[PDB]
Amino acid sequence: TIKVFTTVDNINLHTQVVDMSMTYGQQFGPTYLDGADVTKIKPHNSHEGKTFYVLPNDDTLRVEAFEYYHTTDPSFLGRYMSALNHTKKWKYPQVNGLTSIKWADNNCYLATALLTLQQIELKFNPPALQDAYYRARAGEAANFCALILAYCNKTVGELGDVRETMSYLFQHANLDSCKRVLNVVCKTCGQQQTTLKGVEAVMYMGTLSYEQFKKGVQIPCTCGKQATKYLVQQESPFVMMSAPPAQYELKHGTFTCASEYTGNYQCGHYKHITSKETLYCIDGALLTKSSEYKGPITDVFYKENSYTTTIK
Numbered sequence: 455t456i457k458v459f460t461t462v463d464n465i466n467l468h469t470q471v472v473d474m475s476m477t478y479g480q481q482f483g484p485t486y487l488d489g490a491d492v493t494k495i496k497p498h499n500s501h502e503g504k505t506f507y508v509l510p511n512d513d514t515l516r517v518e519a520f521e522y523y524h525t526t527d528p529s530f531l532g533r534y535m536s537a538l539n540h541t542k543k544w545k546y547p548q549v550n551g552l553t554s555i556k557w558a559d560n561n562c563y564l565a566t567a568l569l570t571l572q573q574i575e576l577k578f579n580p581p582a583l584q585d586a587y588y589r590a591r592a593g594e595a596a597n598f599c600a601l602i603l604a605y606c607n608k609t610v611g612e613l614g615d616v617r618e619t620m621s622y623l624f625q626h627a628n629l630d631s632c633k634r635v636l637n638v639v640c641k642t643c644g645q646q647q648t649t650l651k652g653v654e655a656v657m658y659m660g661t662l663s664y665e666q667f668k669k670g671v672q673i674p675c676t677c678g679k680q681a682t683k684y685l686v687q688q689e690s691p692f693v694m695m696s697a698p699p700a701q702y703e704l705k706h707g708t709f710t711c712a713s714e715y716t717g718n719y720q721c722g723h724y725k726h727i728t729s730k731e732t733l734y735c736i737d738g739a740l741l742t743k744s745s746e747y748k749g750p751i752t753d754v755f756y757k758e759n760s761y762t763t764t765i766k
């Protein structure tokens with residue numbers, strides 16, 4: 455017989471003694487070692503002393519699972535371990551002082567999101583996400599990338615959209631203090647003010663330019679006549695401006711980072727543009743730099759703290 459450790463969070467470890475005759479699935483249930491399904495695998499000698507991930511089978515494991523992951527989905531652990539099995543074999547090179555991902559299994563949208571998260575201020579609510587976030591910034595982003603896929607209900611190889619991945623991650627972050635006050639202007643109905651909170655206060659779909667959002671954009675009113683919507687007040691550490699892929703010029707120092715999308719719908723490829731001392735383009739493990747940039751951009755990220763418009 456061998457002595458092992460079972461856990462759901464890799465923190466609260468539980469001591470267990472197993473029988474080498476019965477497989478792990480008969481004694482613990484669905485069991486995993488470093489992302490590998492060891493349910494139908496009998497206990498081995500190298501397995502002694504190692505820590506095993508198990509699906510919660512009692513209330514103590516269930517409670518511990520929620521405190522770390524903030525989910526009660528019984529499929530989360532398996533989807534997490536299934537993604538981890540791939541992400542542990544990916545390469546995570548340091549590029550321009552940032553942790554990127556060598557291209558594999560259509561992970562270009564994951565690398566772009568990973569590079570973006572290292573350049574904006576964000577705090578994740580699930581301790582599992584925050585801990586992996588920290589380790590990702592230090593260069594060990596395998597667990598973080600697997601968690602992103604599990605939280606987004608995406609599998610390795612699936613075609614991913616960066617704007618949708620960021621929105622899913624934003625919903626698992628503390629954006630309660632983020633406030634956005636808007637104002638619509640219609641020739642017939644008049645002027646109406648709205649206040650957005652949370653994820654809706656930091657994301658917009660329609661234009662890439664934060665300045666254009668401040669000046670105003672044409673949105674259709676409920677009466678038929680076109681209206682004008684502009685930003686009144688913004689209280690957030692950042693702002694994400696999105697638009698369908700189109701040719702766009704990125705000026706050095708006017709933005710934080712941006713998402714470049716080339717190719718067909720869903721089947722395209724992502725690249726990451728970041729504004730440093732000069733404009734840098736990160737394509738997985740490849741790095742290029744230029745003083746100017748013009749290309750198909752679909753997301754742009756800007757810095758912010760507090761903004762109040764001057765329009766009367």
Ligand SMILES: Cc1ccc(OC[C@H]2CCCN2C)cc1C(=O)N[C@H](C)c1cc(-c2cnn(C)c2)nc2ccccc12
Pocket residue numbers: 613614615616618659697698699715717718719720721722752
């Ligand atoms: C890469 C990718 C993976 C999946 C995916 O779809 C999953 C969606 C489907 C609906 C629900 N969710 C599962 C889309 C893409 C993709 O290609 N994203 C680029 C940036 C893109 C966006 C838009 C567009 C226009 N409006 N909105 C709101 C987004 N249009 C594009 C037109 C041409 C080329 C790229 C476009």
Ligand SMILES: [Cl-]
Pocket residue numbers: 524525
């Ligand atoms: Cl929650």
Ligand SMILES: [Cl-]
Pocket residue numbers: 524525626
């Ligand atoms: Cl959740």
Ligand SMILES: [Cl-]
Pocket residue numbers: 557558559560561562563723
């Ligand atoms: Cl790719």
Ligand SMILES: [Cl-]
Pocket residue numbers: 605
């Ligand atoms: Cl979700």
Ligand SMILES: [Cl-]
Pocket residue numbers: 524579580625626627
């Ligand atoms: Cl959460």
Ligand SMILES: [Zn+2]
Pocket residue numbers: 524579580
């Ligand atoms: Zn939560």
Ligand SMILES: [Zn+2]
Pocket residue numbers: 539540541543559610
């Ligand atoms: Zn793989």
Ligand SMILES: [Zn+2]
Pocket residue numbers: 525605626
């Ligand atoms: Zn969720």
Ligand SMILES: [Zn+2]
Pocket residue numbers: 640642643644676677
């Ligand atoms: Zn009206």
Ligand SMILES: [Zn+2]
Pocket residue numbers: 640641642643644675676677678679
């Ligand atoms: Zn109107």
Ligand SMILES: [Zn+2]
Pocket residue numbers: 560561562563722723724
């Ligand atoms: Zn790709």
